[PDB]
Amino acid sequence: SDLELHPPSYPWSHRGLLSSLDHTSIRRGFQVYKQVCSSCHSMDYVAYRHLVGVCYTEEEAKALAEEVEVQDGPNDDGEMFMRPGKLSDYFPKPYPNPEAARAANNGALPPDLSYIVRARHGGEDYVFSLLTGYCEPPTGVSLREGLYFNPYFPGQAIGMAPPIYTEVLEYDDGTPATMSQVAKDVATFLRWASEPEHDHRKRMGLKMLLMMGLLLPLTYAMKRHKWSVLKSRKLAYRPP
């Protein structure tokens, strides 16, 4: 349809000017991506070494990397072998090429969710409204098999099967894995994946604001002190 539905603004914990991301939510959204979203979507620009100092220690991230297998080679005989993963490895693609991705998902290519927050209007609000907005189609429109009605998708007929539901996965910390909680955690994690510099950027911005609020009256006072010779200058004209 020509008319479209805009996602609402949710009160995110990082929505403030100086507010940081919640790293427990990023960790929870990482395992939400791992046991659910990694079967169809790739993460070509995020490695396992990007998670250390953010959500996991080096031992936990090393165990996560050694859980999955990565093709590597070739050897001295000239063949590609199947080694365990390392910290430097990128996240494993579900499909080697987009053609088998379109074949496995019935024509539709599942996109790379590396900057899917920054590639869409609304950011993570769009992702949260897309994952928690799967509703039945209204009367007057007929939906063919293999398509699903999501009003936040452009054209309102998305090709993605509804991926999350209640207790779709189990959390390590005992959080109740409701559908909205899973969607919020994966939206926080995708926001981190699009902007990994976000916390450092906001800390640098706080330092910039404090330093420039210090510097501005001081250099204004210096400018006004040097210009007070001209600002207080008086003129007189006495022809004979």
């Binding site: 950027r201 640098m204 911005g205 420039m212 400018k223």
Partner: protein, 380 residues
């Protein structure tokens, strides 16, 4: 002994330009802006140099190299977003500088004005090719749109566009030559700005009153030096709160996808400093006429010295032409808003009225208003 500042053959130029240059005492804060432009220019160059140290001009490894800059290079996100937001702030300072020149009658310096118009063309070409450079979706499709409207030229347009492209479409030859041209053009802009300052210093600078300022003149140091340091620090404040708090309020989200020739975006538009030009282009139902109107819009900005039909230089004492000037500025804002809109109701008629009023205010109504106040003040 001697004075080393005035007798050294190298220090004499800096003494004549930035130390003992006679300047009007009553110039306002708008006179900071051009100096800020120069500072912003070198800032761009510095950031660009470091963005040249990790970027690969190749369609397989352009977007991946940009993501490698953003994620893996230490503070590479900071330098990249400083480069983009400083390009936007460079155009902000450009429009305010040109608006100062239009309002205060600084276009009577004809050689300086035409040299500045040449600088404006060069920086617009530099920013266009630089926006093509990261090879997103909007980069590829904006390059396609601009080169197609260049191909609208009869009988030489097709040959010129396939020679600019290096092929039958936008490909890696176009990307590499755009990287080379985007690299080399700011040094041409720097040399041209040196010529710009040379012509200004041999003709002198202008006060906001438009009167002869030789009665009250002050050295550049230490008044306008510290005033420009304050302006530089305010420009750094706005640039740093744009790079550190809202990195993407001016950017395009569709540029964060890899470039796909098979998929076209639902809406294709250039950046906000091209949007009024695009809205002027989109109004005329003739592609040759649209390109003609774009080039003659910037050329009637260049032609503005020859429309001065008033005995007073600045607009300080000309309120009717002041009103027409603010109508022109608001019309430019309207064209900027329309340029980011699709061709739907009621944007076509609004854009056509905006372009007609823009050309009428620049060409017709301003000399008429100048003649009207000339009669109205008993000048002739």
């Amino acid at each position: 002994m001697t004075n080393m500042r005035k007798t050294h053959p190298l220090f004499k130029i800096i003494n004549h330009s930035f130390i003992d240059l006679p300047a009007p005492s009553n110039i306002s804060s708008w006179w900071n802006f051009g100096s800020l432009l120069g500072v912003c220019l070198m800032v761009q160059i510095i950031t660009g140099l470091f963005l040249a140290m990790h970027y690969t001009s190749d369609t397989m490894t352009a977007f991946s190299s940009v993501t490698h800059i953003c994620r893996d290079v230490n503070y590479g996100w900071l330098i990249r977003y400083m480069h983009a937001n400083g390009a936007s702030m460079f155009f902000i300072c450009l429009f305010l500088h040109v608006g100062r020149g239009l309002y205060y009658g600084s276009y009577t310096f004809m050689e300086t004005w035409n040299i500045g118009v040449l600088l404006l063309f060069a920086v617009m070409a530099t920013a266009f090719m630089g926006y093509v450079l990261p090879w997103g979706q909007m980069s590829f499709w904006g390059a396609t749109v601009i080169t197609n409207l260049l191909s609208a030229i009869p009988y030489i347009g097709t040959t010129l566009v396939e020679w600019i492209w290096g092929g039958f479409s936008v490909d890696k030859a176009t990307l590499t030559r755009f990287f080379a041209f985007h690299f080399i053009l700011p040094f041409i802009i720097a040399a041209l700005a040196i010529v710009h300052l040379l012509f200004l210093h041999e003709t002198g600078s202008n006060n906001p009153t438009g009167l002869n300022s030789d009665a009250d003149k002050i050295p550049f140091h230490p008044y306008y030096t510290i005033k420009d340091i304050l302006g530089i620090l305010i420009m750094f404040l706005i640039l740093m709160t744009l790079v550190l708090f809202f990195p993407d309020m001016l950017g395009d989200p569709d540029n964060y996808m890899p470039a796909n020739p098979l998929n076209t975006p639902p809406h294709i538009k250039p950046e906000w400093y091209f949007l009024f030009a695009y809205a002027i282009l989109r109004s005329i139902p003739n592609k040759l006429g649209g390109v003609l109107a774009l080039i003659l819009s910037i050329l009637i900005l260049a032609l503005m010295p020859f429309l001065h039909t008033s005995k007073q230089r600045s607009l300080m004492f000309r309120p009717i032409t002041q009103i027409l000037y603010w109508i022109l500025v608001a019309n430019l804002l309207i064209l900027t808003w329309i340029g980011g809109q699709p061709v739907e109701h009621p944007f076509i008629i609004i854009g056509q009225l905006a372009s007609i009023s823009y050309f009428s205010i620049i060409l017709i109504l301003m000399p008429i208003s100048g003649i009207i106040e000339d009669k109205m003040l008993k000048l002739y």
